[PDB]
Structures are given as C-alpha cells and as structure tokens.
Design a binder for these strands. Structure first.
Ligand SMILES: [Mg+2]
Ligand SMILES: [Mg+2]
Ligand SMILES: [Mg+2]
Ligand SMILES: [Mg+2]
Ligand SMILES: [Mg+2]
Ligand SMILES: [Mg+2]
Ligand SMILES: [Mg+2]
Lengths: 165, 156, 267
RNA sequence: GACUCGUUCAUACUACAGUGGAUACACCAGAUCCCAUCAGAACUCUGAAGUUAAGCACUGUAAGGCUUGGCUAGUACUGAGGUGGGAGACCGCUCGGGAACACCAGGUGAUGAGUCAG
RNA sequence: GCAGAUGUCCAAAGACAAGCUCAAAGAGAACAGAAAUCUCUUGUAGACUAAAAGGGGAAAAGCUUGUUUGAUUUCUAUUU
RNA sequence: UAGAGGACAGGGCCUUGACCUAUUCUCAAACUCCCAAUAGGUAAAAAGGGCGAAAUAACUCAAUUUGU
C-alpha cells in the first residue's frame, strides 16, 4: 500500500590508504562527480604493515539522497551492465558493488590524477524510518516492516531488469 | 603502616543495592522540614557533595539549622565514658524525615476524642497503654473425632 | 553465535523510568526547575509549560505537588478559530496568540486582570513563572520563544534573554521579530511562490484560498484577534465506540485452549 | 473515544503474532524566510494530497523475566546452663530464636491535576 | 600478618552549556587478506573517566564542540 | 570433572580438538541473587502539647497579610 521500498541514501567511498596529495586528488574526484564537499575518514588503530597512523586522513566519502542518488546508481549499474552476484545482498536488505577505474563514469583523463576506484552501497528501506531517528520519542520498527534479503532481489529485478548470477 | 582515611571500610555500606542504582527521584526535593524535627541520616553515594562521615550512617537527630540545600543535625556519640553532642552538616539528599515518632502522634490525636467524650459523660476511663498479660479461662468444644494421636518416630 | 538476550541477561536488567523510556521527561531539567530553597518554605515556583504537537501548540501553568502537579491555566491553539483566526494554527503568530491567551485567562481567575494591563498593541510586582521547553532544542527563532513573548506582553514576568529571537544571533532587532509575530514571512512566501510555480502555489496554500484569506490581509486578522483576545479571555460557557476492546482470559480458560489444540494436532 | 503535565519505577520489561482511525496523536507534502548540516537523514521553519503499513492503544503464547503465596523445614545455623558424652575430631540434653537455593500454584497493574470532541 | 600504593601529574586533565553514545559481535562493499575505510542489525556498560584499590556514573560524571579563568578577596558554625 | 545433541585444520563421505545449545561432579579472608541468632540507635506529654484571636519586623512572597 504505502509499504513500498525506496532508496534511503547512497554512500560513496574511496580508501586511498595514505595522506598527502593523492587523497586530495581523490577528494576532488568525489567533488566533481557528486557536487558536494566530502569529508575524510580517520584511522582508529595503528598497523605497521599497511603504514597507517592514528588520526591520519586515509579516505574520503560522501552520501546523497533523492533525484541525484537514483542516477549515480544508474551510471554505476550501467557500467556493470546490470549484473550482480547473489552474495552482494546482506541479510538485512541492502547491497553494493564496486568500480576499478573512475574514468568509466565520464570524467576526462588527467595526467596528474591517475586511476581511482570507488564503492557503492544503497541501504534500502520503507517509509516511517523517522521514528527510529527522531530525538523526542524514538522507538523501534516492527519486524514485518523490515526488508528481507529476498525483497532486495525482487526489487532489483523489477526496478532495473537486473540479472542475478 | 596504618591506614585510617576518611572513607575506609565503606565497601558494602556506601554502595547501591541490587537493580536500584541511579540518582534520586524528583519528589525527593519536595520534602518539608522545620526546626526541631526528627530526622534520619542515610548516606546516598550517587551524590558526592554533603556526604556524612562513616559513623553517622543510620543515626537519628534533631534539626538546628536549615540552609539553601543543607541541614544541621544534633547527634549523640559515645566517647569512652560520656556522650558528646555532635553537629553534623550534610546536604539535602542524605536526609530523611524520621518515622520513629508517629505512634506518639497518632496516640495523642486518637486519645483526645476519647477524653473529650469521657469528660462529656462524666466518666473515669484509663488511657495508658496495656502490657500483654495472662489469659482468662474458656470452654473449648471439640468432637472426639478431630483429636489425633502422635508418638515419637523411629529412626531411618 | 553466543546469545546475548540470555536468561541471566534478563535477570540482571534494571529498567529506566516510564517517561524516560517513552521519551517525554528529562528528569535532570525537571528537578532543577522545581527545587526551591529549603529555608524559603511555602513558596511554590510556578512554571510555564509549552508543548507543540504536530498541527497545534499548547500552554499551561503548573505547580509541582507531591502527589501529582496541578494545572492552574490552559490554552490550546484550535481555540483561535473562535477568536477569528482560521487555518494556520502552527505559526509563530499562532504561538504568540496562544501565549497571550493563557496569560489573560490566568489573571482573570485571580481577579488581577485590572491591576496588570500588560502592553497594548504590539510595537506591585508581577507574577513570576519559569519556562519549560520540553525536549526540543533552542535555536534562534524557535517557536517556544514566541509564546514567552506573548505571555510577557500579558501581565506575567518570564525571565529571559534576547539573543534567541529570529535574526538576533548577535544583535537584537525588534522590527524583524514584529514581522514574525504578524506572520509577514508567510505573506511574503505567498507572494514569491505565486510568480513561479503558480499551480504549486495553489497546492501548498489550499486551505488558505478556500477560506478567502489572501496574502494582502494576513497582518490585519492577527491584529484584530489580539484585541478580541484581550476583550474576553474566559473559557466558553457517552460516545458510541463502534469498535470494541477485548478482555483478558483466566487460568481456567487457557488450559482448555491447549487441550483442544493438542486434540486437533492428534489427528 | 482522545490529549498534556505527573506518581509508583518491570504485575509496568523482552520476543513473536491478531485487531483499531468522528475529533485527536502520528507517519506524511516541501525548503522562500529564522535556523542546520558532507548530506532539509537529523535540527529548524511553511503546509494539509494520501495512509493505519509503522509508531501508539487493546489482546494472545503449557512464552523468558518479574511479582505474591505454599513448601523446602523446625531442616541448616545460633543466645544462655551444664563436676554433660568422647583420647580426640566432634555430638546430645534443659530455657529460647530461626534461614536460604530449588520445586509447585496464582497474577502481568494501579493512580493525581487539567483539557478536547459527539 | 596478608595483596599493594604515596613525596607526583594537569591553561586543561579546572568552570558552564549544548549535541551525541561506548566495548564487542554478525552479515555486506574495487584493489584489501586475521587486522585499513564505509552501511546496517544487536548491544545495562562487557568501554572510558592521570596514577594502587574500593565506591559512583548513560538525553552523563564518558566523546566532540562554543564561551571562559569561581584554581579570586574577607569572616563564621563545624567533621575526621 | 564428565559425557549428550547440533551447523575451522584432518587422508582422501569419517580421527580429534574446536564453536553453539541444554545437562553434570566439586570450591572462595581479600566472590554475591538471598540472608539469621546475638549486638546497636531514636521515641513513649505540663520551662510542654492542642486550638482561636490580636500586636512587632529592615526577613520571605505576585500579596500593608502570602508566609515565617
Ligand atoms: Mg562508610
Ligand atoms: Mg537542557
Ligand atoms: Mg497493522
Ligand atoms: Mg512465564
Ligand atoms: Mg557500576
Ligand atoms: Mg550534558
Ligand atoms: Mg557448599
């Protein structure tokens, strides 16, 4: 009725693993694609082998909603020609995939930038999600109202004519 | 070396009870106190201001001073051949209206009407309480069918 | 996968208060707002409660007693339909008017409305009360501060600063406050939405056009209602229940529901 | 039939299910203006097309927990007396007080001040 | 007698306010794996709170922000 | 301490120890859901208590009566 399923948001992530100029170039790539100033991720712990230090900027990410989200998703699923494995769907009703080169999305090559790859993730949900996030009288969503793993596949098939391996 | 600090030996006395942690209720702040009232000192360890000393936990005294959020109490304490009066200054969360006095007040209010009636009809009534005493004789009726015979038990 | 909601987990659980569990009362702001000096006994410290539901706004005067506090005055926003204000009953102006109504009504009950006139049209020691904002957060232009202004413009004294009125983050301009009290922001919205999106203008303000309230006569209706509210604030002077509530079974009944379930399972 | 502010602070909590929409409480339609973010998600401001799907109210489950009573049991411990028993370790008698786990059964709330609608 | 600690440290780790919620686990996402960043679901504190050990703490006493210098001058009733 | 019932390594559809769920023998000055017997503390009326009127105040209160 009004328990249809929509897209709550779309989170874009690129982990470079290092500080300096490369991270700022990746941030510029995200700004160009999404038209939003992004923010940077900070490493919780210390690991010698990956060369990560505490509080150091390692990645940059952004989140989008509404009309803009359904078309960045469209570009991403176009690059994969609407092909997703069945493993990509979590047991809660979400999914996501990846891209190895950011040029395929329509950004002109640049001798300074190089290649960057990103991740996509969707977080499907129905309406009435506000009660779990409002400050005043926040409560819980019942269980039938939640989205199951089968529904995240039926929705994909119907909406995008996608193909499940 | 010896260790006689201020809160020594308060592990079990100064800790919240089971499934009853947390700060006090809102109605705690609406209690009414006057000069000369009786009062109980019960330390509440979720408020660290105005904390009474170890000894005065669970004692009873009279009020001699009232302030913004504090109360002064007169408490007895025995020192080796005599009893000294102490003036304890605690905050309002560690103070409770005493209940040791309620039987006297109910007794006065109740006996007033009895005296009023007795003098109204010119009578001689006793109002002092009565110690429990011996019992009078009675005739207790029991059918012979309801008496049961018992005897010591063999060992197993 | 070790289970978390174990039997031992349930045995040790301590529950919070009912109204904290329901997201209604703070209980740290309440007690600070109620406690008075222990040596200042027999003084009650009234407080001005403002709540804003979805499509309404409420005001009260409470007194914080030991068995349940007492309401001394009350005023709801839908009552403004009687004072000549149709739809628009969530505005900044609606808040102002509801705050005014409560003050005038409260003074009348005590026969003091003639010694405390408040202020005339918007441009002894008074009774004092303190503002309870509930759970909302206090930005600038929050609608609860319009109620405070409408009640101070009455005969009351609500202690307050000046930097939380609209557009007053660092400087206090009274004209822009006066604009929001008379709903001029709504009027200018009706203006600007009319030029572009002329059909969206008809969809957004449907219940305005239906009542014939145009963007050129908004201020005057609030001005009229202020005078009317001051003129007479007194209060004006079973259900079928087509659907039924079921009852609770007992120990005797629940046993045969299991007998018959097992008998049905047997075949 | 509903609402605001409270008291008790699980008989009031947790999991899975069934029922309900005069007014009302919500989900909801938006971002010019006060205001707020990476993000009108949240916060704030302006509305009234749609819906009981969810929140919420009321019920169910040889439900878990909680709570009261029976029982465990005069059992385990213990105040006073003894030119009491016994190599001892320990244990009865006289005058007194008296548990806890477990197990069985019944319940799953009650209430103060004010207000709205037919 | 038993198991330990003290002769330090801090312009913030002192004051006030607001917003927020921690350890851990499961399932998902290009390089990426046991450990890097991101989304969701559970979570009564299993984290944190200068230093021994005990007590306290969840719209906070923890985390992050904004404004500060009540770590100020003088006196009394008193507890250990 | 010991079996029972369930869905990471083991040569080529099974050792074993894992992980989970109900059980099972035995413990604590510096452990605790519960919790005695003994041992403690306050109270049991006339320099006081109750009740009704007044008079004083620079305190308190929206109150020349609000209260104290
Ligand atoms: Mg102590
Ligand atoms: Mg606050
Ligand atoms: Mg339903
Ligand atoms: Mg049960
Ligand atoms: Mg604790
Ligand atoms: Mg805070
Ligand atoms: Mg034993």
């Amino acid at each position: 009725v009004m328990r249809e399923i929509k897209v709550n948001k779309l989170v874009l992530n690129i982990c470079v693993g290092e500080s300096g100029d490369r991270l700022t170039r990746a941030a510029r790539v995200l700004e160009q694609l999404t038209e939003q100033k992004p923010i940077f991720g900070k490493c919780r712990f210390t690991i010698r082998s990956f060369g990560v230090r505490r509080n150091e900027k390692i990645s940059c990410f952004v989140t989008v909603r509404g009309k803009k989200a359904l078309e960045i998703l469209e570009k991403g699923l176009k690059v994969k020609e609407y092909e997703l494995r069945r493993k990509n769907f979590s047991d809660t009703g979400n999914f996501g995939f990846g891209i190895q080169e950011h040029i395929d999305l329509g950004i002109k090559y640049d001798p300074s930038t190089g290649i960057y790859g990103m991740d996509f993730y969707v977080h499907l949900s129905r309406s009435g999600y506000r009660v779990t996030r409002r400050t005043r009288r926040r409560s819980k969503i019942s269980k039938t109202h939640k989205v199951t793993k089968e529904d995240a596949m039926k929705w994909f098939q119907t909406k995008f004519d996608g193909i499940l391996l | 070396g010896k260790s006689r600090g201020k809160r020594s030996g308060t592990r079990y006395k100064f800790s919240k009870k089971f499934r009853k942690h947390g700060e006090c209720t809102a109605n705690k702040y609406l209690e009414k106190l006057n000069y000369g009232d009786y009062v109980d000192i019960v330390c509440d360890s979720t408020q660290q201001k105005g904390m009474p000393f170890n000894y005065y936990h669970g004692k009873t005294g009279k009020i001699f001073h009232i302030t913004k959020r504090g109360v002064g109490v007169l408490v007895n304490k025995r020192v080796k051949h005599r009893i000294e009066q102490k003036k304890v200054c605690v905050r309002i969360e560690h103070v409770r209206k005493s209940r040791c006095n309620e039987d006297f007040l109910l007794r006065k209010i109740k006996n007033a009407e009895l005296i009023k009636e007795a003098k109204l009809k010119n009578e001689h009534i006793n109002i002092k309480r009565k110690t429990e005493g011996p019992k009078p004789a009675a005739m207790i009726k029991v059918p012979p069918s309801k008496i049961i015979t018992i005897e010591p038990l063999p060992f197993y | 996968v070790k289970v978390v909601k174990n039997k031992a987990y349930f045995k040790r659980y301590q529950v919070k208060y009912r109204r904290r569990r329901e997201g209604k009362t703070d209980y740290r702001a309440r007690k600070a707002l109620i406690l008075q000096d222990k040596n200042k006994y027999n003084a009650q410290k009234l407080r001005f409660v403002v709540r804003k539901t979805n499509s309404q706004v409420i005001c009260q005067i409470a007194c914080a007693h030991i068995e349940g506090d007492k309401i001394l005055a009350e005023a709801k926003s839908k009552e403004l339909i009687r004072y000549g204000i149709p739809v628009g009953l969530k505005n900044y102006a609606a808040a102002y008017a509801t705050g005014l109504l409560c003050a005038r009504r409260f003074l009348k009950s005590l026969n003091l409305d003639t010694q405390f006139l408040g202020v005339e049209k918007v441009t002894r020691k008074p009774i004092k009360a303190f503002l309870d904002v509930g759970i909302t957060r206090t930005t600038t232009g929050n609608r609860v501060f319009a109620a405070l202004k409408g009640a101070c413009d009455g005969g009351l004294n609500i202690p307050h600063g000046n930097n939380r009125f609209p557009g007053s983050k660092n400087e206090f301009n009274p004209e822009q406050l006066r604009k929001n009290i008379l709903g001029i922001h709504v009027a200018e919205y009706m203006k600007t939405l009319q030029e572009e999106d002329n059909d969206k203008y008809k969809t957004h303000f449907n219940d305005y056009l239906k009542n014939n309230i145009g963007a050129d006569d908004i201020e005057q209706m609030y001005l009229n209602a202020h005078e009317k509210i001051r003129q007479n604030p007194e209060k004006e002077s079973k259900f079928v229940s087509k659907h039924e509530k079921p009852k609770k079974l007992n120990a005797k009944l629940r046993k045969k529901r299991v007998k018959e379930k097992l008998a049905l399972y047997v075949e």
